[PDB]
Design a protein around this ligand. Sequence first.
Ligand SMILES: Nc1ncnc2c1ncn2[C@@H]1O[C@H](COP(=O)(O)OP(=O)(O)O)[C@@H](O)[C@H]1O
Ligand SMILES: Nc1ncnc2c1ncn2[C@@H]1O[C@H](COP(=O)(O)OP(=O)(O)O)[C@@H](O)[C@H]1O
Ligand SMILES: Nc1ncnc2c1ncn2[C@@H]1O[C@H](COP(=O)(O)OP(=O)(O)O)[C@@H](O)[C@H]1O
Lengths: 375, 375, 375
Amino acid sequence: DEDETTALVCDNGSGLVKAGFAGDDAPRAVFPSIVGRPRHQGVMVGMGQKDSYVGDEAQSKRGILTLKYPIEHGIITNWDDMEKIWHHTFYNELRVAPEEHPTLLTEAPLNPKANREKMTQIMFETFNVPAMYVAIQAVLSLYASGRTTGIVLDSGDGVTHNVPIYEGYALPHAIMRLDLAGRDLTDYLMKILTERGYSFVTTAEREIVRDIKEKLCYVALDFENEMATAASSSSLEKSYELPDGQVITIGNERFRCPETLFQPSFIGMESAGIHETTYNSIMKCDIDIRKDLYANNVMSGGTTMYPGIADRMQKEITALAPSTMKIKIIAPPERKYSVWIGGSILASLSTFQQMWITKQEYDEAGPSIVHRKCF
Amino acid sequence: DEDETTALVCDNGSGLVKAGFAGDDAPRAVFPSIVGRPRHQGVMVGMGQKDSYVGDEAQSKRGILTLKYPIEHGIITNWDDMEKIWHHTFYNELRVAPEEHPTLLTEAPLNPKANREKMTQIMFETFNVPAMYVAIQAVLSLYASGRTTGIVLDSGDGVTHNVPIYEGYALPHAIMRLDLAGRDLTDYLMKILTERGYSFVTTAEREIVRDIKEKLCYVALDFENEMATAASSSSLEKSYELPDGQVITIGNERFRCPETLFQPSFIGMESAGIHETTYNSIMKCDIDIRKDLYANNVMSGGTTMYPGIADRMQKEITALAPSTMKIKIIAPPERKYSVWIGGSILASLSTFQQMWITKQEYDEAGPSIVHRKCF
Amino acid sequence: DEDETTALVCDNGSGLVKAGFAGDDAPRAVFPSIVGRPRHQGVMVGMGQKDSYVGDEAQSKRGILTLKYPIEHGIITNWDDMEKIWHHTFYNELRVAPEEHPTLLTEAPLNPKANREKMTQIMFETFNVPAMYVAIQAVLSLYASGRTTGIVLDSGDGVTHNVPIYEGYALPHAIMRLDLAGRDLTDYLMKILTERGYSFVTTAEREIVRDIKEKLCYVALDFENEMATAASSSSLEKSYELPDGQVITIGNERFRCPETLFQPSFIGMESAGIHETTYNSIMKCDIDIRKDLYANNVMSGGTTMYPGIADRMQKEITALAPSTMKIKIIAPPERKYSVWIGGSILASLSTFQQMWITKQEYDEAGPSIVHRKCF
Ligand SMILES: Nc1ncnc2c1ncn2[C@@H]1O[C@H](COP(=O)(O)OP(=O)(O)O)[C@@H](O)[C@H]1O
Ligand SMILES: Nc1ncnc2c1ncn2[C@@H]1O[C@H](COP(=O)(O)OP(=O)(O)O)[C@@H](O)[C@H]1O
Ligand SMILES: Nc1ncnc2c1ncn2[C@@H]1O[C@H](COP(=O)(O)OP(=O)(O)O)[C@@H](O)[C@H]1O
């Protein structure tokens, strides 16, 4: 609180907002992106509740609330709800006066121009920021990495991409999309557990299943052989206590759930699994740069956090590639916050501080400015 | 009683067993699935009563008895009780020697493998059937229909499903579940009648309320406008004589009870009403097959028997679908026995007689056989 | 069905088989070249479906099926699938007995010798044709035209060529290749529509986009000025109803998609646009024959069907050529079937009937015969 200034790095996630100050090593505020007020709301004797805050309160308030994601699949679809999320971010989580900070916002891949313009309009008109930037989330991640060359497999919450990069450039024609990512894997685990006679269907039960997924699932060494071991499997049958206190047993569901990344037909997806899309992406590049891609396969995103994933990707890529090809899979430790960190590096870039968009630019060429000939 | 043979078609319902001979047009035996013996049992001077027969005796014996459904929510949960129901089916209702007849059994959606194996074990070991098949009840219904394409709304006793079908295949990812169906509507009518100062709480009173529901409830043309007419409603106020002989008056409860299918929040269900699930199911299918689904919405199940339901579904679907979409609701007349009829067609399928499971198959690969690579 | 005979003219296209009788004015059978069976195949209650017929059934059966082209990029790559396509052609579409008809087959430019030999082996051994010929598809088209001199721009489904011709001879060193053609333009329209927030990614969605392309795209008068008019463009914003019934709006995508033929960098292609390749081809010819080429630029192929293409080519060629050069663009009306018609003329050539290849020639010098010293 003086001269200088930082850069409000707000990564608008499909399920979680990550926000903080440029220059910090990780976001200081992480809260669910949802909207929820009592679904039954039966009055009582007073009030003192906040209608649809969701954020952190919701979670801990599981069972009372309803949820909505105004950013459900990564694109913002409800501006009144998004204004509530940004107000919460600035005033309740970070506890800042937004008019004192240049703010860098992230946007999903394929975000419409008109959507970026509405984001810009709200920042300047509603929150009175002195400036702002919009950054592409994949791009920020790439930034955080620091690798000019290599092929990234980025699997997050709602989408997975394979992005080959040569000298810093995402050759746009090589990238392929997959709908599936963590949101789909949590829904599939709810369904397969419901196969055993359990019942996980409510909003609260979804949260419970997301926790089972993140704590007990793993990727097999070989799907077929893991299924065969399931028979005499005395390991798989882990126990998990529900908040009600009942204890369920989870066995082959531990590896059947994430097997979907390699076999999208488990959820009905025709798409090619992540090892096939990696190969298909490398084959859309020049033959010449393929050796550099094969030796620099970088994993990113929350859904690449499973133990065993790098070794499995090494095995599968080795099976598809030429016999003399050197293959290397890199996974950065704390991948998931790779998107926020790239934003932090960019926003905290004094040297490229002219890329931030300003109140004068917005007034001159409206918000589009932050879209036409920059970010 | 000679060569050839029929197929024992036993549809194990949550509230009613439907059983008969393959090839008959409808089941010859329909009896409540319950277990009940005197709750007070005060001896007397002799016996000559059957402990927990339930079946038909129970009903007519209302007030003395207790009830249990070993198939309460569609999945068999008590094998000693289920053995009693099957013994009653074979020896008391159909009056057959089970060792002379291949028998097709039905099972609920999501029935565990181990449950199908126990059903199979009992048929072969306890009843000595020469063969048997297990069939999926929804599937049998689909079979009875005869429509390859279209979206079915099947509302029965304990569950309601929306199932889109293209060329005979239930695209498994499109189907959505609802807990609510007729069991819930009877419980809700007991509760709302208890609001007027009446008291319907016992087992006998539940049966009385199920009769009021089936004889006097109806679905409104528009819920809001029907409530508004309730004021000057001189029609609604129908009379119903209780077995005690008192006469109650039923008015807006006639349409408030089934309104729950369209507004599950009446019983506290967050779920989306049946018109919303229909739309949500069609939107999980390819855009291309949607025109075929919209023109082939087939209603099935006992809870789709209300007069007015097809016209209301036509109105609601028309309001959600594109303006140029051709919408058609089909309701087969005697829907409820749609499940038994599909079983009868399948079981009575000489041409597919190799799908029946045999005593040799059970002995070789145990009962699982009737589960792994068939039904 | 008597003496004489016709010539089975089968044009094996990358996406469509065109087949018929020599002497007919157009092919009597046109069906997609694909292979597809249920991707989900969920059994049901019977069969009566044909595993991977594709042909016409597929299309109308959009959403159920998968596709494969055994001729994906013009060269046949799977002989078991190709045998199915030829069986369908003869027995289901044309309804002929192939052993009664000399059959002329077409092959892509640069088809390997061994591939032509395998085509020949199948015709004689599998279908028992009395004779057969293999013809080069470009060549057949040239044949259909009837112009000895001039430079043809032939843009079809998977490839575009510029072919200068002087007295009937394709000076082989002048011809240049382009990967891009209609297959690429349909893929690019799917991608650019997905930019607006729509989602066209499935096999069924590809077919939908191919229809939007063929019905609503057009080539601009000037790309830069058309983009500038897009702003106040109230024309562009045509509506298109999807099979689901939703209605999308298409605007600048109408001309951005085919702009790729003139600017291959839109899809990442370094190649020179079709006006530059025309000029580059004319400059590889003698200076002396250039006046004849400039006055005889003939358009051929499905991708030259856009309204406005001849006028745009006249404008662009005029801008590159010497000021006193007479420039004329010819487009034959029903260009697309230009390949089949050339085959029909050739095959129906009684006078050159000795060029057909016979069962004795195949037995003597194997199939190669139809390759070494003829077609
Ligand atoms: N340790 C972990 N193991 C597996 N999945 C994880 C782990 N940590 C986070 N995830 C999942 O990663 C997803 C979030 O990843 P993220 O990269 O932030 O996604 P997005 O950027 O698409 O919002 C969620 O589905 C979450 O459950
Ligand atoms: N005419 C009717 N009107 C309304 N509900 C009916 C009618 N006939 C039967 N039902 C109800 O339908 C339900 C039984 O339907 P059914 O399809 O057999 O269910 P399930 O297969 O789930 O056992 C019961 O709740 C019953 O009261
Ligand atoms: N009227 C049209 N306008 C634009 N493209 C068209 C038209 N008719 C056909 N096409 C396209 O032309 C291509 C087929 O042309 P064709 O000459 O048969 O190709 P090929 O011989 O390479 O198989 C397809 O991409 C198709 O969509």
